Design an enzyme around this catalytic site. Structure first.
Site, PDB file in Angstrom:
ATOM      1  N   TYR A 128      -2.853  -0.980   9.948  1.00 14.07           N
ATOM      2  CA  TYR A 128      -3.258  -1.064   7.855  1.00 14.07           C
ATOM      3  C   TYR A 128      -1.552  -1.101   7.725  1.00 14.07           C
ATOM      4  O   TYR A 128      -1.105  -1.584   7.225  1.00 14.07           O
ATOM      5  CB  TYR A 128      -3.416  -0.487   7.899  1.00 14.07           C
ATOM      6  CG  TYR A 128      -3.751  -0.850   6.139  1.00 14.07           C
ATOM      7  CD1 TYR A 128      -3.102   0.153   5.090  1.00 14.07           C
ATOM      8  CD2 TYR A 128      -4.221  -1.616   5.422  1.00 14.07           C
ATOM      9  CE1 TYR A 128      -3.691  -0.516   3.781  1.00 14.07           C
ATOM     10  CE2 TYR A 128      -4.532  -2.558   4.404  1.00 14.07           C
ATOM     11  CZ  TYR A 128      -4.181  -1.080   3.425  1.00 14.07           C
ATOM     12  OH  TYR A 128      -4.071  -1.782   2.049  1.00 14.07           O
ATOM     13  N   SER A 185       1.025  -1.208   0.224  1.00 10.37           N
ATOM     14  CA  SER A 185       0.466   0.102  -0.214  1.00 10.37           C
ATOM     15  C   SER A 185       0.640   0.849   0.206  1.00 10.37           C
ATOM     16  O   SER A 185       1.819   1.176   0.653  1.00 10.37           O
ATOM     17  CB  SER A 185      -0.981   0.566   0.609  1.00 10.37           C
ATOM     18  OG  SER A 185      -1.298   1.319   0.827  1.00 10.37           O
ATOM     19  N   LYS A 195       0.953  -3.588   6.097  1.00 10.12           N
ATOM     20  CA  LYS A 195       1.857  -3.447   4.528  1.00 10.12           C
ATOM     21  C   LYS A 195       3.428  -3.335   4.727  1.00 10.12           C
ATOM     22  O   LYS A 195       4.157  -3.886   3.855  1.00 10.12           O
ATOM     23  CB  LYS A 195       1.285  -2.163   3.701  1.00 10.12           C
ATOM     24  CG  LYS A 195      -0.295  -3.246   3.870  1.00 10.12           C
ATOM     25  CD  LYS A 195      -0.699  -4.640   3.082  1.00 10.12           C
ATOM     26  CE  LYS A 195      -2.002  -4.592   2.834  1.00 10.12           C
ATOM     27  NZ  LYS A 195      -1.803  -4.519   1.571  1.00 10.12           N
ATOM     28  N   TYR A 203      -8.488   9.888   3.513  1.00  5.70           N
ATOM     29  CA  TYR A 203      -8.101  10.395   2.295  1.00  5.70           C
ATOM     30  C   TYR A 203      -8.047  12.017   2.100  1.00  5.70           C
ATOM     31  O   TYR A 203      -6.830  11.978   1.336  1.00  5.70           O
ATOM     32  CB  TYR A 203      -8.274   9.489   1.561  1.00  5.70           C
ATOM     33  CG  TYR A 203      -7.946   8.100   1.600  1.00  5.70           C
ATOM     34  CD1 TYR A 203      -7.234   7.811   2.279  1.00  5.70           C
ATOM     35  CD2 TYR A 203      -8.609   7.128   0.400  1.00  5.70           C
ATOM     36  CE1 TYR A 203      -6.493   6.489   2.831  1.00  5.70           C
ATOM     37  CE2 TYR A 203      -7.705   5.893   0.472  1.00  5.70           C
ATOM     38  CZ  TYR A 203      -6.753   5.684   2.421  1.00  5.70           C
ATOM     39  OH  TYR A 203      -6.900   4.423   1.577  1.00  5.70           O
TER      40      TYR A 203
END
Ligand SMILES: NC(=O)c1ccc[n+]([C@@H]2O[C@H](COP(=O)([O-])OP(=O)(O)OC[C@H]3O[C@@H](n4cnc5c(N)ncnc54)[C@H](OP(=O)(O)O)[C@@H]3O)[C@@H](O)[C@H]2O)c1
Ligand SMILES: NC(=O)c1ccc[n+]([C@@H]2O[C@H](COP(=O)([O-])OP(=O)(O)OC[C@H]3O[C@@H](n4cnc5c(N)ncnc54)[C@H](OP(=O)(O)O)[C@@H]3O)[C@@H](O)[C@H]2O)c1
Lengths: 261, 261
Positions: B158, B144, B162, B203
Site C-alpha cells: 500500500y 497517504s 501511494k 498503527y
C-alpha cells in the site's frame, strides 16, 4: 592491510545485467569476489560476454534467462540461482524501461508496459530475494533521480514507477529485518547507457536539435563535477551497500547524480 | 459577485464519494457552491444520500456508477459528467483500498488488487480529468502518510501504491500547466472511516487486545493535538486546494495527519 568491501564467499544475482548499469554492477560484484547470476531477458550474447568478463577476473558466473515481468519466471530464476551456486546472499533488482509522453496521451498499454517491469517486477524480485536469501543478506532496487529529485515534463509514468520503489524499500527493510537482510535503492541521474541515448533529448528544451554527443556533453554539466554519470558510478555504490560495511544503510534511497540535485 | 474561498458556478467530480473521505469531500465542495458528481462503485444508497445532502444545502448533484479500476468506465464517468452539467472544473481522485502483509506473503493477485485502483486507477482519472476539464481547473489525488512520512511493518504494498501517486502529481503539474490546471495530492494520516477500523491495530504500539473503539482512542494520541483525523479534515484541505486561492499550491503532496509526523 585492511581492504574494505570484499564479497568473497558471496553469491549475487543482478537482473538485466547483460548490458547497461546492470552489466557494470555484475562485473563489479565479481571483481569484489562474489559469484554472479547474470539475468537477462533478450541480450543473450551480451550476457555471455559479462559472464566471460567475470570469469576472467578470477570469479565465477552464470547467465540465466528470465522475463522479470513474469512472476513465475522470477521464482524459477531464484530457484535456479540457489540450485546452481548453493546459496544467494545479494540480490540487485536493476531491469527497467524508460517512457515519455504527455499525461493526455498515455495509454493503458504503456502504463502496463512500464509498471509491470519497473514496479511490479521489482516488487516480486524483492519478494523472491527475501524468500531465497541467506541471513544477513542484501537487496538493492533501482529507482531514479526523477522519482523525487528531478522533474521532467512528459515523464510522469516513469517517475511514478520509481516513486513506488522508493516507498517499497523503506517498508521492505522493516519486513526483511527478521532475516537481517538490508534493503535499499539506488536512484541514478543521467547515466550513459542505451537508455540514456534513447531519451537524452528530454533533459533539454526541445533537445532534438542537438547531436547525441552534444546532448551527452550538456548532460555532463548537470553535476557540479562536470562529467556524466557512468554505469561504474552506480556499481561502486551498489558494491558498498551490499558489503558488510554497508549494513547501517538500510531502507534508504541514494540518489546518484554526482551532486546535480 | 465572487465570494473568496467559494466554488459558485463550478462543477466538481469526486471518485468513491458514496462513503468515507470521498463523501465528506463531495458534500463540502457542494457546501462551497459547486455542483457535484458523486461517483460510486458499489454503495448505491450511500451515494444517493450524499446527492440528497448536497441538494439539501442548496446545490445540485448526480450519482454516477463507475468502477475506477476500469479505464473505459473512467472515460464514461467523465463523459457523463460533462454531458450532464455542461462542463467540469474540479476532479478529486479519492477511491482506494488498504492492504497489509509481510513482503514474503504478498501475492500477484493482491499486488494487482491494490495497484489497479490506488495507482493505475488514479493515474487514469488524472488523464481523463485533463481531457475533460476547463482551463484553470483543479485535480487532486489521494496519497497517504505511509507513502513517505510514516513507516509501518507489513505495509509495503500500500505504501508503494501511494508513493507512485506522490511522484505522479509533481509531474502532472508540469503537463497540466498547459491548461492552467493545478495538480496536487492529499496524504491523510489515520482518518476515521471503514478503512481505518480495518487496520488501526497496525498503527499503535501493542493494541492486540483492543477493540476498534479502544484502538481509535489510542490512535488519537499520534497527533500532538490529541485527536483523530476525520473525513472533514481532508475535505477542508481539498476545498482550499480546489479554490482560486489555492492556485499557488501546485505539484505538491500535503500530509494531513494533524502534526503526527
Ligand atoms: N541510465 C539512466 O540514465 C538511468 C537513470 C535513472 C534510472 N535508471 C534505471 O537504471 C536501471 C538500468 O538502466 P540502463 O540505463 O542500464 O537501461 P538499458 O541500457 O535500457 O538496459 C536495460 C536493462 O533492462 C533489461 N530488461 C529489459 N526488460 C527486461 C525484462 N522484461 N526482464 C528482465 N530484464 C529486462 C535489459 O536486458 P535485455 O537486453 O536482456 O532485455 C537490460 O539489461 C533501470 O531500472 C533504469 O530505469 C537509469
Ligand atoms: N482512512 C484512512 O485512515 C486513510 C489514510 C490514508 C489514506 N487514505 C486514502 O483515502 C482514500 C479514501 O479512504 P477512506 O478511508 O474513505 O476509505 P473507505 O472508507 O474504505 O472508502 C473507500 C471508497 O473508495 C471507493 N471504491 C472502492 N473501490 C472502488 C472502485 N473499484 N471504483 C470506484 N470506487 C471505489 C468506495 O466506494 P464503493 O463503496 O461504492 O465501492 C468508497 O467510497 C483512499 O484513497 C485511501 O487509500 C485513507
Amino acid at each position: 592491510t585492511y581492504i574494505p568491501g570484499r564479497l568473497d564467499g558471496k553469491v549475487a544475482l543482478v537482473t538485466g545485467s547483460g548490458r547497461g548499469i546492470g552489466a557494470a554492477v555484475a562485473v563489479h560484484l565479481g571483481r569484489l569476489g562474489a559469484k554472479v547470476v547474470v539475468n537477462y531477458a533478450n541480450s543473450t550474447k551480451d550476457a555471455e560476454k559479462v559472464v566471460s568478463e567475470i570469469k576472467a577476473l578470477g570469479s565465477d558466473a552464470i547467465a540465466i534467462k528470465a522475463d522479470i515481468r513474469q512472476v513465475p519466471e522470477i521464482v524459477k530464476l531464484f530457484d535456479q540461482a540457489v540450485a546452481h551456486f548453493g546459496h544467494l546472499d545479494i540480490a540487485v533488482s536493476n531491469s527497467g524501461v524508460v517512457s515519455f509522453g504527455h499525461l493526455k496521451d498515455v495509454t493503458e498499454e504503456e502504463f502496463d508496459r512500464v509498471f509491470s517491469l519497473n514496479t511490479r517486477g521489482q516488487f516480486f524480485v524483492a519478494r523472491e530475494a527475501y524468500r531465497h536469501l541467506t541471513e544477513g543478506g542484501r537487496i538493492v532496487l533501482t529507482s531514479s533521480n526523477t522519482s523525487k529529485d528531478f522533474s521532467v515534463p512528459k515523464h510522469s509514468l516513469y517517475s511514478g514507477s520509481k516513486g513506488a520503489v522508493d516507498s517499497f524499500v523503506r517498508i521492505f527493510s522493516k519486513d526483511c529485518g527478521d532475516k537481517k537482510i538490508t534493503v535499499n535503492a539506488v536512484a541514478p541521474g543521467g547515466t550513459v547507457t542505451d537508455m540514456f541515448h534513447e531519451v537524452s533529448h528530454h533533459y533539454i528544451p526541445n533537445g532534438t536539435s542537438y547531436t547525441a554527443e552534444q546532448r551527452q556533453q550538456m548532460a555532463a554539466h548537470a553535476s557540479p563535477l562536470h562529467r556524466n554519470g557512468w554505469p561504474q558510478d552506480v556499481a561502486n555504490v551498489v558494491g558498498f551497500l551490499v558489503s558488510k560495511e554497508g549494513e547501517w544503510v538500510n531502507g534508504k534511497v541514494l540518489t546518484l547524480d554526482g551532486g546535480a540535485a
